[PDB]
Every structure is written in C-alpha cells, then in structure tokens.
Amino acid sequence: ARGPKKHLKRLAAPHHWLLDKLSGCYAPRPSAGPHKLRESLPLIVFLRNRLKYALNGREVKAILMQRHVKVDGKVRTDTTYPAGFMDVITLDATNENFRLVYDVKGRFAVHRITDEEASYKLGKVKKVQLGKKGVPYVVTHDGRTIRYPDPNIKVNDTVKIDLASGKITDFIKFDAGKLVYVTGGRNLGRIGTIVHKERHDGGFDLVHIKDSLDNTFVTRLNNVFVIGEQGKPYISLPKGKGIKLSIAEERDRRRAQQGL
Amino acid sequence: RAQRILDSIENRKLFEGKNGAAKIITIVPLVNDLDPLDILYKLLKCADDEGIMVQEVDSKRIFNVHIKKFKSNLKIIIPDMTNFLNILDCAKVADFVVFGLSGVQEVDEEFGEQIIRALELQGIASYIGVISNLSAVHEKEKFQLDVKQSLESYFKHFFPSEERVYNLEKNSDALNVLRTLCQRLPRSINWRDNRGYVVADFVDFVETSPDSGDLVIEGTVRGIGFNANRLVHIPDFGDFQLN
Amino acid sequence: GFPMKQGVLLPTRIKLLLTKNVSCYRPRRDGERKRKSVRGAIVGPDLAVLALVIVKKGEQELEGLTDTTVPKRLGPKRANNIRKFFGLSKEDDVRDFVIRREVTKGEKTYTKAPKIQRLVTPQRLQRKRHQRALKVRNAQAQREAAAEYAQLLAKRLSERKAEKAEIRKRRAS
Amino acid sequence: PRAPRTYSKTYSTPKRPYESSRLDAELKLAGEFGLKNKKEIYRISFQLSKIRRAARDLLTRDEKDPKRLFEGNALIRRLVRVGVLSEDKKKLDYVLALKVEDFLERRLQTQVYKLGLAKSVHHARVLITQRHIAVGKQIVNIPSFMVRLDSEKHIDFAPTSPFGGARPGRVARRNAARKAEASGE
Amino acid sequence: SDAVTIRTRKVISNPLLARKQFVVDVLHPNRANVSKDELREKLAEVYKAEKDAVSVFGFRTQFGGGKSVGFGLVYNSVAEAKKFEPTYRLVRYGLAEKVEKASRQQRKQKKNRDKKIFGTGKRLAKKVARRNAD
RNA sequence: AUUCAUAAUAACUUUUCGAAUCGCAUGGCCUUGUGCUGGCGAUGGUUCAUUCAAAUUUCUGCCCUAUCAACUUUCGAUGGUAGGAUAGUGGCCUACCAUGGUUUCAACGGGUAACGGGGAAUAAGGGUUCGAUUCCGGAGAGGGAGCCUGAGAAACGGCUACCA
RNA sequence: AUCUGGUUGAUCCUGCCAGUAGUCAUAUGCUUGUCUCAAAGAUUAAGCCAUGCAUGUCUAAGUAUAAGCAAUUUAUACAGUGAAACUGCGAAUGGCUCAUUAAAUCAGUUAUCGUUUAUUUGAUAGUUCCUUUACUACAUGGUAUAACUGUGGUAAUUCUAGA
Ligand SMILES: [Mg+2]
Ligand SMILES: [Mg+2]
Ligand SMILES: [Mg+2]
Ligand SMILES: [Mg+2]
Ligand SMILES: [Mg+2]
Ligand SMILES: [Mg+2]
Ligand SMILES: [Mg+2]
Ligand SMILES: [Mg+2]
Ligand SMILES: [Mg+2]
Ligand SMILES: [Mg+2]
Ligand SMILES: [Mg+2]
Ligand SMILES: [Mg+2]
Ligand SMILES: [Mg+2]
Ligand SMILES: [Mg+2]
Ligand SMILES: [Mg+2]
Ligand SMILES: [Mg+2]
Ligand SMILES: [Mg+2]
Ligand SMILES: [Mg+2]
Ligand SMILES: [Mg+2]
Ligand SMILES: [Mg+2]
Ligand SMILES: [Mg+2]
C-alpha cells in the first residue's frame, strides 16, 4: 500500500492474545513503542481480556484516563500501548503489581509481584556501542538506552535496571551454565540452563538448553534471555517454573486434582 | 457491446420525456369497491405535485402528466368500469397495465378474474401489481404483510413475470413503481405494434360536403406508423379511408 | 464575473494555474493547484466593474465617501503594538491603555477587553528561570556521571596492571 | 469481513440408491426406534464412520506411541461416557466392531421407552418434543439427545409438565371449565 | 408457590472503576422471568447501595424456563455510576435523559450543506437579500 | 568480515540545530529592590537508538503450446571504467570501451473465458479438478501520462492535460 | 477399496454410449410450517450512472473585543462557554474489484558492511551582540494576514475582487 497500516484484522492478530473470533472484525493494533508488534501485549488486552477489569473498550479508556495504570514506573495513557516482555505494570488503586512473563504454553501470563520486586527490571543487551564524544552505551531489548555501563558488559548480557533512576544496578554475563528464559520461538516460555552455545559465523547461533527435568532442546541465540544462576533467578518465575510437560502429563495432573 | 449499447439507446429514444414521449399507462382495478382516481392520486402525490392532482379531480379521465423527477411524458387512462369491452379497449392500446388489488375484498371469479384472463389473451405489454386497500386491514404491519403476500401468490398465478405486488401505502414502493413507469422500457405486443396506432387527444370535425366531411385527429403515433394510402380502423365505427 | 489579476498584461481573459499565495483562488486542500479563467490587468470595454482607490482628494466633497467616516474595528492586541498605538515608554504598563468596548444587554452594560499577548508577566520570568535552571543542573549532573565513570575506568586499568604484575612475577618464577 | 462461520454436513447418502436389502435393513432400523427420515439413520452411519476412521488411523501406528495412547484413550473414554462401548470392551479393536444400533440405543427417544415413561417408542417421540421430559434440571426436546451414562439416572418428567407436576394442560382445564360451567347452568 | 432466588457469582471488587461486578443467577420457578427493575431493588439491599447505584443487563432466560443468567455491577456511589456507566443504560434507569437529535441521514445532510459555506454566512445573507430586492 | 563506531588535524557552508511557546499550583529568602530564587506537565526541538514501516534483495518453486528453434544488442542486450541521478545499491541513465547474455535441462514467441498463496471438492492410496470471494501479498480506480503537498501518494470521495 | 443396460442366432472379448454417486457449485422448475446460522451483480459489460451518504478533527493545557451565549460574583489586560477562521494533525488507513500480470506477482527463505523513516519509547544540548568587562530590546524584537466591518461582480460552482 502507500503508508503504514493503521488497522489489524481479527484473525491476523498474534494468536497468543487469545482473542475470540466473533467478538468483532478488528483487533487492537499495538501502537509504536518499546517492543515488537508481534510479541507485545497492548494494555487493553492485558486489562480487559486477562484481568477482566473492564468489559468494553471504552471502559478501558476510562480506566486508563485516570492515570491509574503505570508501566515501568511511568504512566501510560494509550489504549494500545505495547507492553511486552519483562515489563512491570502497576495498578495502584488495587495496590497490585504485575510482570509480563511468558506462561509455559507460550502466552502472556498474569503474575503478581511484591513492591520490592516491582522496583527493578531485567534487560537483554541487544547492543553496546560508542556514541558521541566517545561515550559508550547499551541498548536493551525494551528499547532503553543506558549510558556509561560497566565495560564488562557486551552483547547478550542481561542488565538489572532500577526503574526509578533508569540506572544499571548490576548485570549478568552470558556463560555456559546459567539460567535462561526463552523468549521467541517454539520453546518460548521454557526455562533452563545453557549447556553450550553453538557458534555459526555469518549465521544464527544456537544454544542447547537443559531444564530442571534434565530434558534438552535447542533455540537460536536470538531468543535466549538470561535470568540468573542455577536456581537463583533474579525475578520470580510463575507457577510451572518454565517446565513443559507432555500432554499426557498434563492430562494426568488435571484429572488428579479432582476429589471434590 | 458498443453496437448493443447504440441500438439500445436508439430503442430507448421513443420516450425522450422532454418533447417526444407518450407512455400510456392504464389503470385497471379488479375489485368493485375500489377507486382508480385514488390509485393515480397516490402515484402523483408521491411525485410531490398537488397541483396536477387538484386540476384532474374537476373534470377528466385521460391525462397528460409530465413528471420532472425522471423527466417523462405519461398518459394516464382510466376505463369505464361498467363496460367490459371498454376495459379491453383501454388496455389493448397501453404500454403499461397497472392492476389495482383490494386488501379487503377478494377478486371476483366472474368479473375481475375474467378481466385478467381476457387482457392476457388479447395482448398485454408490461404489467404491474399494485395495492391501495392495505391500510383498511389491521393497523399493525404483521397482519398487513399477510394479505400482501397472499395477493402476491394470487397475482403470480396469472402473471409469473412478476413476484412483487407493490404497496402504495408505503412511500418507497409508490416512488418505485412511479420510477419504473417513467424509466423502464415497455415490451412489445406484436399485432398492435405492426400496424401502428394513434391515441387521440383532440378530435375536431370539418364540413366539406353536406353528407360527409373530415374527422381531424390530433395525436401521437406509436408502433409502425401510418401511410396515407392505407385504411384506418376505428373501434365501434368501422374501417375508413384517409384524405 | 472573472476578476482582474495584477500581472497579466493583456486586455482579455486567460486560464491560469493558481497556487497558494495568489489572487483569485483559495486552495480547498493542502498543496492543491487549479486551472481557472482570469481577466487581464488592462481595462477594456467588457469590464462590468472597475475597483478604484482615492489617493488625492479633490475640491468638492463626496457624499457617500468623504462626508462619512468609519472607525477601525479592532485596536491592538500585542503589548508593543499597543505601545506603538499610544507611543508609551518602555516603563509604562500596557494594562491601562487597552481599548475596551461597552456591550449592552437587558439592564446590564458589561465591558470587554482584548487579552494582551507577548506580555511580560511573573509567569514567563518563572519559566525562563526554569529553563536556565534545568539546562545548567543537567550539565553539572552529566559532568558528575562522566567523572564517576572515568574514576571507575582508571581504577580498572590499575587493577589490570596489578594483575599483569602478578602474571609477570609468576612467569618469571 | 467477519471470521467465516465454519459449518459442516452431518450425514451421507448411500452409494447404491435402490438396493432391496439396504432398503429393508433401514426400514426395520427406523421401525425399532421410530425415526422419520432415512436421514436420521445416515447421520448415525456417518458419525460411526468418522469414529472408525480415527480408530484405524490409530491402529496402524505402534503401541506405546504417545499419539495412539492419547487419542486412543480419549476416543475410548468418550465412547464410554455415552455407553456406546461397554465397560469391558475398553480397547480400540472393539470400537471398530461397533455397529449402528449401538448408537441408536442411546437416544433420549429410546431411553425414555426403556425407562418406561412411555408406552411405545412413538409415544416417546411425542413426549419429548412436547417439552415433557427432563434430564435433571434441564428440559430437553430433541429426540437425539444421546444420553451420557451419568445422566441416565436422572431422566424424569418436567417440573413444568402436567405429568411431572404443575397444573393440568390447556385441554384438561378446558374440559374442567366446560363441565363446571355446564353444571353451574 | 414462587421463590425468586438471586445469586451472585464470580464477584470482583474493582477499585479502578470504583465498582463491584458479578454474574447474576436467578432461580424463578413458576415465574415467567424476573423484571430488571425488581432485580436492582433486590440487589441494592444486599450490597447496601442506592437503587440507582446498581446496574444489571444482558439477561438470558434458559431453555425450558425457571432460570436466567445476567450480569450486574454495583458502584460505590451513584455519582460514579452516573459518570462511568454507558449513557443508554442510564436511560433505562431514568437516571438520565434521551437527547432528541435528528436522524443520522439528517445530521449528515446538514454537515454537508454547511461544508459549502465559507465563513459565517451572514455576509452572504445580506448579499442575497440585497440581490433579491434588486 | 569493513575506509565500522568513535576520536583528532586542516578548512569549508546563500550556516542546520542550540525553547521569544502553553496549562496548573504559588512558595521560599534577604542588604526590603515588588530583588534573586522555586513545584508539577504540555508542546516543541537536534542527533543516536527503538518501534511502525518502506524500498530493493538471495536461493527454490508456476497452467497450455514446436502448426513457436533460435532469441537478445542502431534505440542497453551482457560486462568494465567514470560520471550523472536516486533515500540509497544497480545500464537506472549518459559517454567511452569491450562482445557478450539466454537456449531441446524447451529460451523466445503465442494462448489463458490466469491475479498469486493460505485454502476448496472428490479419492483406500496415488491422484484429478477448483481457488473472482471473509486472512496475507499484489495491482487498478473510464483509458493513458504528468505532478503538487507531505514522513509516507506517482493518490483519483487531490490536481493538470490529452482520448473516450 | 462395489458397478449395471446396450453390437450377436447364441458366446466370450476390446470398446465406448447410457445408467449410478458426490460437489459445504451455479441456474432453474415444482413445493414450503418452526429453531439456529449464513452467503448474496464474481462469471457477461474493469459497461454507464439521477439523487443521498461514505473524512474529518479541541483538551486545565496553540490563536477569541463574535458588535455571540451566560451573567456573576473578586479580576480595568485576559480569565466562564464558544460559531467563525488561522495554526496543528489526519485525509497514504479503511472499503471495493480482479482489468492487467506466466520467474512477473506470490510462497518459503535470506540480505541491507546498500538505504529512507512522521509517529511511539529511551537517551541526548553551559559554547550561538561588539571589546575584555566598557558598548548595543532579553522584564521578551518585527510583519503581515483570515475570520469580521463594509463595498462589489456573474445565469451558474465548495467563484471571488477592491478597501
Ligand atoms: Mg488498502
Ligand atoms: Mg521463529
Ligand atoms: Mg550507452
Ligand atoms: Mg557507479
Ligand atoms: Mg483475467
Ligand atoms: Mg480410484
Ligand atoms: Mg483467490
Ligand atoms: Mg474474471
Ligand atoms: Mg485483499
Ligand atoms: Mg493506486
Ligand atoms: Mg465503470
Ligand atoms: Mg499529513
Ligand atoms: Mg492516478
Ligand atoms: Mg468514488
Ligand atoms: Mg481511496
Ligand atoms: Mg456418464
Ligand atoms: Mg461485473
Ligand atoms: Mg462483491
Ligand atoms: Mg478552553
Ligand atoms: Mg524523542
Ligand atoms: Mg514587511
């Protein structure tokens, strides 16, 4: 066409929003922002579909317009604001704190968070580089640019960020045997330890990962996102702990939680 | 397709509703307790012209009505509904036959039905099925539409070309039937179109000899046309020759 | 009806492509241009009306013209425009010299007055103060950050020289 | 621009149209159970068929393969909840052997006549579509309800119905009014 | 022999919209389904709010009868109800008034005619009255 | 993986940006000048990054026809150098050089009552046949061509011309 | 995972014609009570179109002397509301159709160390009159304009001229 599109048809929306397919004909096209369209969750979706806090769309606008909803410490008032991975969401009138982290089944999940964990945030470092007047900086996956980091921090490292000041607390290096959330791809929503990184030059690096049930899988480096240490994560994982079960296992677990 | 279109324009130029047109519509109610003047009143009150209605009530039965909405020259004819053969004579010259239908009274098996059939046999151009008495039934539409549809299935029987009996009570259908009468091209009836015919507006007489003279007839020619040498028939008068 | 246009040196009519800032046209839509007939600049026998201005008054009075006089609808709105209309000093407050109008209704007679623009008030002084403030404050804060970083860097290089000292003593031993 | 509302046929017309044997078989089948179209039979034949397909497609795969296990067990326990497949035949190889009558025997229509709330099967028809016959707290008016097993022990008359309780119907109080008014006179 | 029982399920306390929302079960045997008005009345006494601070909608009477589900919100004051609710609901509750504005057709037509007028138009009125007197 | 990021020298420039803007609160501190300070947020603004894009782009894949066997290059066909143009690579164009490039593994031409795909119908399987049409991509707005505005249009519920 | 009738005096074949079933595929005939649901000028003429509508937009927070509305309770700069118009943004999305188009489009997959990017988000800015503390608005320069007042033109337009 000619310019950027401004709509999003219902069926063409990213599936893991779980929008029903007779509600309408369109679906909340995420605004421009911190995260990629395909892999972000517009606040309206988070608010009306996943918290049930509002029934319509205008109820959601109504909510948003009282400066109620914060995202990463700050107040956003865009129905289609693109809150994606690892972002903190604050509802002060309920005194609740949310974190957008992936469920085992590859979709976004509600996750309650203490005030002491809401303060900070992780960020995969997508690129370090040297800017004007020779001042070195990183660019972290949520789009944040941070100046004067510690020289030990190269690509793929995770960074802890005080949401308040926007400064770097500490960080984590990308070495064999760390804890890791896998963000894009099929194994998205899993957690495990990185066995070894496979290096393919001019192509996509892979990573072998072994979870807590000592089962293994492989994903591109592109989707590996470092959390912390062996059983010492820097954020609180959801229930499921990024441990994916065969449909048999889940069938059994469900039928075994029925005794009335 | 360009040829087709040209030919179609040529065949649709007989009704240039500004100077050279004469669309004959004949109004035929099929029910005793029904008024044709009323049916016309509806069709021309939906043209928003109160004057052309008021000027006709006084003294007339044949009218030259020009509609400006669609730019068309209609000629309306209402028959002497006491004379059967006058009804037949009326319709058999028409380009259009409107049928009035009653919501109250069922059409007569011995009279109105025979109007239908006989018109149908002698020849009919384009016909339409229209109602006026529909408001006379229950005020709620739920019951009126019943009558309408039963009438539609009665009317479909003799005239399968149509499936919609139009209701003049509603402004839409009336505007639509008027629309059709104006725009839609009327089909051809073989025998009448191949020998020509003039409907007379003004008939004057000039004395030439003490025992015979010259009937003068001012009217528009439709069909094949007339030649000075050929004879002319005039119904219930006989065959005469042209001067 | 077609209006005359200054420029077109011709005693007739000619179609032009008119644009934004010209006569005889008002652009309906942004950047739109249009082809219109326009009348030449040179007066002829076709003109229904000629539009004339008076530059030098004559000996005799003109009834509908010179005899009557119409007041200018609107007085100044900007502070220094006012200051020019009443020839006031820099130190004269403009507040008082502002033209008002006396509107009438019912049994009340109320008076309106134009808002003064570009008017120096405590507010704008505050905002400017705020600008110098945030600019300088920001600059000093930045210098602080680069200082702390340079401190870190310099300490790390010295740590690196100590490590290489240990490695040189281990390689020599 | 909506989503396109999906939909599907339900039955399937026989291949040979006039086949004196199939004709009869069908008629006796409609007779045992009071069906009105042959179509009612076809619908069953068709569901049956889809099950026999799922069946085979599982059968050709290795035992102790995740898929045959999962979908096998599912298909089985599904067939069991409606009591089409008996408790003891709980293995795929029987679900093939299944025939039409095994399905035709779980209709609400049927179970109403086999729980003796009706005199004949046709009576059961009428009684169902007449909004008389409830399954627990629900009325049901479709002759093809397909009674699950845990819902067998609940079927009774409707708390709405004349027989279930409530007041007599329109005919009843019509004749009550007729006799009472004829005697008052 | 009726016994209208009103149950409230899946209840949530929503401070964001200063209200509590929930599902409404209604068991109404022998009863030909319960009016909305009545429902508001009976819910008010329960959640201790004004009859106008309660809203109920979407009620669907089950097959066969004697039950129906709907949805219901109830605000912390009637002020907030008045400012958060959709207007047509507040018309169902008389708590606001239907505003007589002409047909859609009409409105659009007026907009479009007015497009063809540059400026206030009293100019054009003086001019046309003048050219008509002429 | 770079003549990358970045820094430095020398100059250059019809000198780009470096807040004359708005709404709310109105407080501190003194030499008492109505002096200097002072919260929150809106809009704007340069560069870098990000998001939304866009444009090009690599590999592999298209129905019928030999009663289409040679086709491409004056007029770009294939490549080199240099330039010009473009947001940018690039025969995209312009000069100047070469004499190449495709082809029975079916080019080129002709046909299509041909938009492409996700998909649909039917078959045990293998297939055969549909896919104008609800999602994606493309193309057009009576037919051609040209252009303003703008981040984005060769736009037609914008403009200009010719043809109908 | 099926076939049956037709060449002969009779027979077995090759072989087609005929029959049979499907189409969530069009048309048409005859017929038509109820629930849910749904497509619908694609096929031929990307043929032609009357009328009506489909794109406009203002918040505590760009510009109000409407000679508008509200008067009223502090406002003699303004201060409530606000047509009009200037500014800003949008009109490049959407919706439609399938005419063109056969390595073209498109699918999958790459690349940009080969580029542009309104917007969003995050960072980002002491240097910008003459001399060296003396001289020139920074408590803040300048100009047009619209709407409006009034004068007009023409059969006519979402035409506009002069002051
Ligand atoms: Mg589009
Ligand atoms: Mg992937
Ligand atoms: Mg050349
Ligand atoms: Mg070059
Ligand atoms: Mg085609
Ligand atoms: Mg086969
Ligand atoms: Mg298609
Ligand atoms: Mg086609
Ligand atoms: Mg499309
Ligand atoms: Mg286009
Ligand atoms: Mg057309
Ligand atoms: Mg724009
Ligand atoms: Mg165009
Ligand atoms: Mg159009
Ligand atoms: Mg368009
Ligand atoms: Mg055949
Ligand atoms: Mg067509
Ligand atoms: Mg269509
Ligand atoms: Mg305001
Ligand atoms: Mg920015
Ligand atoms: Mg000047």
Curated annotation (Swiss-Prot), chain A:
Pfam families in the record: 40S_S4_C, KOW, Ribosomal_S4e, RS4NT, S4
Protein location: Cytoplasm
GO MF annotation terms: RNA binding; rRNA binding; structural constituent of ribosome
Keywords: Cytoplasm, Isopeptide bond, Phosphoprotein, Ribonucleoprotein, Ribosomal protein, RNA-binding, rRNA-binding, Ubl conjugation
Xref: SMART domains: S4
Entry similarity comment: Belongs to the eukaryotic ribosomal protein eS4 family.
Descriptive protein name: Small ribosomal subunit protein eS4A
The species this protein was found in: Saccharomyces cerevisiae (strain ATCC 204508 / S288c)
UniProtKB/Swiss-Prot annotation, chain C:
Record key words, sorted: Cytoplasm, Isopeptide bond, Nucleus, Phosphoprotein, Ribonucleoprotein, Ribosomal protein, Ribosome biogenesis, rRNA processing, Ubl conjugation
Any GO CC annotation of this UniProt entry: small-subunit processome
GO BP, one annotated term: translation
Cross-link for Glycyl lysine isopeptide (Lys-Gly) (interchain with G-Cter in ubiquitin), residue positions: K57, K72, K90, K155
Molecular-function GO terms, alphabetical: structural constituent of ribosome
Modified residues (Phosphothreonine): T104
Protein localization: Cytoplasm; Nucleus, Nucleolus
Protein's job: Component of the ribosome, a large ribonucleoprotein complex responsible for the synthesis of proteins in the cell. The small ribosomal subunit (SSU) binds messenger RNAs (mRNAs) and translates the encoded message by selecting cognate aminoacyl-transfer RNA (tRNA) molecules. The large subunit (LSU) contains the ribosomal catalytic site termed the peptidyl transferase center (PTC), which catalyzes the formation of peptide bonds, thereby polymerizing the amino acids delivered by tRNAs into a polypeptide chain.
Sequence similarity: Belongs to the eukaryotic ribosomal protein eS6 family.
Further details from the record: Present with 66000 molecules/cell in log phase SD medium. There are 2 genes for eS6 in yeast.
Descriptive protein name: Small ribosomal subunit protein eS6A
Species: Saccharomyces cerevisiae (strain ATCC 204508 / S288c)
Gene: RPS6A
Part of the full-length chain shown: 60 to 232 of 236
Curated annotation (Swiss-Prot), chain D:
PANTHER family: 30S 40S RIBOSOMAL PROTEIN, 40S RIBOSOMAL PROTEIN S9
UniProt miscellaneous comment: Present with 106000 molecules/cell in log phase SD medium.
Subcellular location field: Cytoplasm; Nucleus, Nucleolus
PROSITE patterns to which the protein is assigned, alphabetical: RIBOSOMAL_S4, S4
Key words of the record: Cytoplasm, Isopeptide bond, Nucleus, Phosphoprotein, Ribonucleoprotein, Ribosomal protein, Ribosome biogenesis, RNA-binding, rRNA processing, rRNA-binding, Ubl conjugation
Name of this chain's protein: Small ribosomal subunit protein uS4A
UniProt function note: Component of the ribosome, a large ribonucleoprotein complex responsible for the synthesis of proteins in the cell. The small ribosomal subunit (SSU) binds messenger RNAs (mRNAs) and translates the encoded message by selecting cognate aminoacyl-transfer RNA (tRNA) molecules. The large subunit (LSU) contains the ribosomal catalytic site termed the peptidyl transferase center (PTC), which catalyzes the formation of peptide bonds, thereby polymerizing the amino acids delivered by tRNAs into a polypeptide chain.
Curated annotation (Swiss-Prot), chain E:
PTM sites of type Phosphoserine: S13, S55
SUPFAM superfamilies for this protein: Ribosomal proteins S24e, L23 and L15e (SSF54189)
Pfam families (UniProt xref): Ribosomal_S24e
Subcellular location: Cytoplasm
Cellular compartments per GO CC: cytosol; cytosolic small ribosomal subunit; mitochondrion
Tree of life domain: Eukaryota
A GO term, aspect molecular function: structural constituent of ribosome
Chain's role: Component of the ribosome, a large ribonucleoprotein complex responsible for the synthesis of proteins in the cell. The small ribosomal subunit (SSU) binds messenger RNAs (mRNAs) and translates the encoded message by selecting cognate aminoacyl-transfer RNA (tRNA) molecules. The large subunit (LSU) contains the ribosomal catalytic site termed the peptidyl transferase center (PTC), which catalyzes the formation of peptide bonds, thereby polymerizing the amino acids delivered by tRNAs into a polypeptide chain.
Note: There are 2 genes for eS24 in yeast.
Family of this protein: Belongs to the eukaryotic ribosomal protein eS24 family.
HAMAP family: Ribosomal_eS24
This protein's name: Small ribosomal subunit protein eS24A
Organism: Saccharomyces cerevisiae (strain ATCC 204508 / S288c) (Baker's yeast)
